[PDB]
Nucleic acid binder design. Sequence first.
RNA 1: AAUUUCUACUAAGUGUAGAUCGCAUCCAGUAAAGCGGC
DNA 2: GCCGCTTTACTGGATGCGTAAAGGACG
DNA 3: CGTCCTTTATT
Length: 1223
Amino acid sequence: MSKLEKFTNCYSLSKTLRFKAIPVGKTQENIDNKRLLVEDEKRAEDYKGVKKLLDRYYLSFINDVLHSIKLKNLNNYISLFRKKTRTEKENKELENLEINLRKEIAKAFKGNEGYKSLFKKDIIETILPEFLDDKDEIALVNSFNGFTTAFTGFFDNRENMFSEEAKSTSIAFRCINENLTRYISNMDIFEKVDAIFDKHEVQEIKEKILNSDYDVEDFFEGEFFNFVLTQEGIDVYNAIIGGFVTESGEKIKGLNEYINLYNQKTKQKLPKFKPLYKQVLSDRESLSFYGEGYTSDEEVLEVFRNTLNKNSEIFSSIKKLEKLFKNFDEYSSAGIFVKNGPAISTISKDIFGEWNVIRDKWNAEYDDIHLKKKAVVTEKYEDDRRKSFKKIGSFSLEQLQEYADADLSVVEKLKEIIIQKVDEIYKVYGSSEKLFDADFVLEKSLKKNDAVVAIMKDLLDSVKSFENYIKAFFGEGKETNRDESFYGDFVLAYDILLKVDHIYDAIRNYVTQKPYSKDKFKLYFQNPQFMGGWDKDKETDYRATILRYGSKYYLAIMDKKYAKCLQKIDKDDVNGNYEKINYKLLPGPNKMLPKVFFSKKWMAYYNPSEDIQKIYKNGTFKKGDMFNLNDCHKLIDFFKDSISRYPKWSNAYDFNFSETEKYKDIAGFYREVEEQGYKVSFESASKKEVDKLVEEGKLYMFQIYNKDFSDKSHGTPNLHTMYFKLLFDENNHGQIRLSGGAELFMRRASLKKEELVVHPANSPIANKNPDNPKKTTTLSYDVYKDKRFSEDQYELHIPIAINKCPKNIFKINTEVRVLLKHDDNPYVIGIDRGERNLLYIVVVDGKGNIVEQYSLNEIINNFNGIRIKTDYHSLLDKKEKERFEARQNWTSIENIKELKAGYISQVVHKICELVEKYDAVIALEDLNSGFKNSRVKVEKQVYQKFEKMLIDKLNYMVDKKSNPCATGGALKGYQITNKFESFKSMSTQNGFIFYIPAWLTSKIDPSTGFVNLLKTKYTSIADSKKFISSFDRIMYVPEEDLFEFALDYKNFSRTDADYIKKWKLYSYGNRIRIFRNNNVFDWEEVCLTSAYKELFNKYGINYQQGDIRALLCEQSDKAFYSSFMALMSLMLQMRNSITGRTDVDFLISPVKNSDGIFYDSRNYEAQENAILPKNADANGAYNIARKVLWAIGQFKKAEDEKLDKVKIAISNKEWLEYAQTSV
RNA sequence: AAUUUCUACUAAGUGUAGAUCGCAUCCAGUAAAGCGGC
DNA sequence: GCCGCTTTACTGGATGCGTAAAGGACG
DNA sequence: CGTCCTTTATT
Ligand SMILES: [Mg+2]
Ligand SMILES: [Mg+2]
C-alpha cells in the first residue's frame, strides 16, 4: 500500500521482446525463389570470417605500440600502491596516477594517424586489401564493399579496446588496472618467500625457462613490467610461476610449484603467485607442448584401427609384456622391484586378497628394531612408521616373497594376475571387431554416436588399466642391482605402450566436443542497415515497417527493387484496409539539435549569431567552471526558434517548452525535447493492394506472433505480450516506447519430425502431478516434443525502452530510508542460503514477530484448487549427477543453467508476492568474492543467480493481474532497486535489498540472545586451570540432573561484545560429535550430564561437593583437561548438523530464558505456526532480518537530511545488546 | 508433453501458470579426464 | 588432498548499440 | 541528378 506507490517512473531501462514471425500468403514462396535466405546464410558465415581477418589487423596494430611502449614513472605508481598509510589526499593521488597510466597507453594507440580509419569504410575498402596477402582473403573482403555499415556494431566493440577509462574491455584496463596490481601484488609476495628458493632452482628456472637472458628476480622489479604488456611476455611470465612442458614431457617446475613443495615439507602456509591474465585480442599459442587433436571423424577412425589393432605395436607391447610375466620365475627376484606409492595397497590385495598386509608386514620389521619394550606402541613409534613406509622407494620381489607365507609363491601369483588381465583385453576386441574392419562405415556422427564411442571408451579404458597397473613395476631406480636383462626388454615394450596415453588424450578431446549445429543467421534483405529504425521518414531507407489488422500485428518488408511500394498506397473507403504505422522519434537531443543546426546543409539557413557558435565552442552552456546561465538561455532560444522553423520536426511533434527563463541547465531543455519527440500514430492503407503487393513479391510480410496471440488461448498473457499491446494502446503516454534496432533471424530446423517423441491422439497420456486428481488426458491431436525445433522459424527481436523520460527523480536508498523512519509496523523478509536447504524465507514484523517461515527446497503452487509441489532441490541434485557421470563417461553433458533459472523465477515470484503483501524490505547476506568457493559440490551458484534475477525483477516489478494503467500494472511498475549496471558498483544497500554481515546470525540463541564467545580448544594445563577458575561457580544441581556453569563474561578475554555479561550455562540436552575414523554411524550423540558424571568419575572427583572449581583444578593429568575442555566445547556447540542427513540440523541452547526453559529448535520444527525458528537455517534468516530491524531503529531516530549518512552495517557489539534485549 | 524462449505443467482441449535483454565483443570462472612433482 | 601443464564441456560478468539526418560518393 | 550507402553528434 503506502511504501510501494512512491516508486514509479524512477529511471529508464531497455528490454527486448522476442516473437516468432510467420510468413503471410505467398511471402515465403517469393523469398525462396529469389534465394534471399541462402545469401544471408552465406553472408553470416562470411561475416564471421571477415571479422577474423579484421582481428588479425587489429592485433598487429595493437602490438606495434605495445612492443614499443614505455611507461613513464612506473615506480611512482608502485610507491604509493604499497604504502600502508595513505590519506584521503594520497588515495586521490594514486587514482590520478592510475588515470594517467591508462592515458599514456591510450593516446599511444590514438597518436597514430591511421587510428581513425580503423573504424570507417576505409579499413574494408583500403587498408585490409593492402595488408592481406591471400588471394581468397582479398576476395572475401570485396563482397562486403556494399555492407560496411553492417560492421558498425563490430567497430564499437573494437573502440572499447582502445578506451582510456576503467572499462572491462579496454586494453589499458587490462595492462594497468588488472595486470599491474597482479604484478605488484606478486612483488609483495616474492620478497616474503624469496628465502626458500634454492640457488639451483633460480638457475633451473633461469636456464630452462629464461634461457639465461634474464635473472629470475628481474620479473619482480618495477621497471621490467614492459616485457609483459604483450602475450609474448605474459606467456613467459606465467611460465616462471607455473612452469611448462617440453617436447619430452618434462614437467619443469615453477615458483608456485616450489613454494608448494616447501609448505608441504615445513607445514606452513606461504603465499603462491597469481598468474597474469591474457592480453586483449591475443591469439595465444601455449608454450607447453601438446599433440594436436584430430580434425574429423575419419581421422579418429583411421588412428583407432591402425594403432589399437592386434597387428600394431601397441598390442605387440602387450604380447611381449605377457611373455615377460609368463617367464617371470627365471629372472632374479632381487632384480625386479615394485614401486612404492599409496596405490600399492591394491597390489597387496591382488596376490593374497588383503589391502594392508604389505604395510602391516613391513611395519612388523620396522617396529622390532625401533620398538623398545618400555613403550610397546607410543604415538611416535606408530607415527614414524608412516614416515619410513612412504620414504621407501620400492620393494624387491624377494622382500615380498619373504613376507609371503608358504605355500604362496609371489612370483607365481604375479603370473596369475597378468594372465587374468590380458585375457580381458582380448575379449573386449571381440565386441569391438566391428570397429576395426577396413569396410566398416559409420552410421551416425561420432558425437551423435554414443554406441560406437562407448566401444572405443571400453577398449581404451581396458588398455589403460593394464598399463596403469604395470607402471608400478618400474620402481624409479636408481636401484643397486636391476636384472637389466629383464628391464631392457620391459623398457622397450612399455615406452611403446605409453603411446596410447597421447591417443587417450586426443580422442577424448575430439569425441567429447559438442557436435556441429547451425546457428540462426541475421536477415538483411540486401540492406546493411536493414530495419534499423521505425521512423516514417526512413521507411524507404530501412525498408521495413509494421502493420496492424485488428488484434494481429504484421511485419512488412519491401524488396530492394520496390522501396517505395508502401508509400503510394491510400485508403480504401469500402473495402478492407490495414492500419499502417506512422512512427516518429527524435533520438539524442544533445546530439541531434546541434548536429542539425550547426550542420553544413542548414548552418546557412538558420544563421546562428556569432555569439551562439562561440557559446557551443567554449561549452559555456554546460554546467561546471565554464558554465554561463544567459548563454545557456540564449542557446535554448536558438534551438527553440530553429525547431519551429524546421518542418519535419515542428509538424511531426507538438512542442510545449516552459519559459526559457525557467530552465536551470541545458539538460532541462533537452529533456523536454526528448519527452515530446516521440509520437506513434496509425494510418489506413488498403488491404487488397497491400495483399497484391505480397503475391507480386514486391513486399514481404510476416505475422508477429506468440502463443498468447492464438485464437485458442483464453488464459492470462505472458508479461512481455502485455508490453507489446501497450506500445500501441492509446493509454500509453510514453511509458513504454518502441525503440529501434530490431533484428530478424532465421533458425533452421535442428530436429527431424520423424524422430520426435510423440503422444498419439486418442491414446491416453498419463499426468505426472500426484496431486492432480485427473491422471489422464485424452487429446484428439498429436503432441510432438520440441516441435518448435522441428520446422524452420523466423525470429524477431524488438527492443523497447521503459520510462525513457523519468518523472520521479530522487535517491532510492534514501527514499526507502525515509519511509522506514515513518512506517509504524514495517516488515522485513529474511532469505538465507544453505547446502541442506537452497533458500529459507523468514518474514518478521516491526517488533521481530514471525509471521511466516518456510523452506524453498520445494516450490508449492495452487491454481484452481490443483496443487503442485515441485521438488526443485531434488531436480538440481539429479541434473548435477547427470553431468558428473556424463563427464566421466564421455557422454552428453546436460545443461543446468536453465534449471537453476527456472527455479529462481518461481522463487523471485514468491518474494515479490511477499513484498507486495507485507510491503517488506528484503534482507540478504553480505558475501564478498571469497565465499563463492566451497568444500563440497555447491548449487550456491543458484544464490548468485538468485540475486541477479531478483534485482532484475525489482528494477521494474509488475503484477500481471492489476490494471496496466494502474500503479503496479504493466505501464506503472514498481522500481525498488537501483539500476543494475554491474555487481561491483554495489554498496551495503540497494533499495529494498539490504546486504548485511552474517556474524552471529546462526550460532545465536533466539530465545535469549546468548552466544558462544569462549575459546575452548586445549592449549595447556595452566590455560585449563585459569579457565576453570574464571567461572563464578561449577556445581552439580541434583534436583534437575544438570551441571551449572555460571560465568561473568568480563572474566574471560574478548568478551567485550556481550551485553548481559552474566549467564548460567547448563548441560541440558544432547549434542552431536563427528568421529575421526564397518560402524553404523560416523557420528554419535553425547549426553552432557551423563558425560560430565562420566569424566568426573574417571579421575575420582566428588562432583556433588557444592562448588567444584577448585576440585577440578586439583588434577595433574593432561588427559583430564584435554577432555574437560572438549565437554565444554560441546555444551557451547549450539548448531548441531550432519552432512547429507535429512534428519539432523538442529539448534539447542545451554541457557534458560526468562521462564527458565531451553531453546531446542526441535520443539519448533514440529509446529505448523511456530513463533521461533524451527532449525539452524530458519534461525539464520530470522536474525538476518532482525539485523535490518536494528537499522530501521536507527532510521526512526535520525532526521531526513541525515538519513543518508546512517551506517546500517551492524557493529558486532551493537547486535548482541539488541538480540539480548528483544526478549 | 506443445512454448518468442526457459521452467514446471496437461490446467477441460492446438493449450495452463510463472519468469524472460536481445545482439555483438573482450575476458574469466567451474566441472571432468589424461599427464608430471609431493 | 596440495601444485603445475592440457584438452573437452557449460557458465558467467562487463562493455557497446538499441538513431535520424547529414554526409558523401556514384551511375 | 536521385538513389543508396556512410558517417556523425554527444544532457
Ligand atoms: Mg498464458
Ligand atoms: Mg556443474
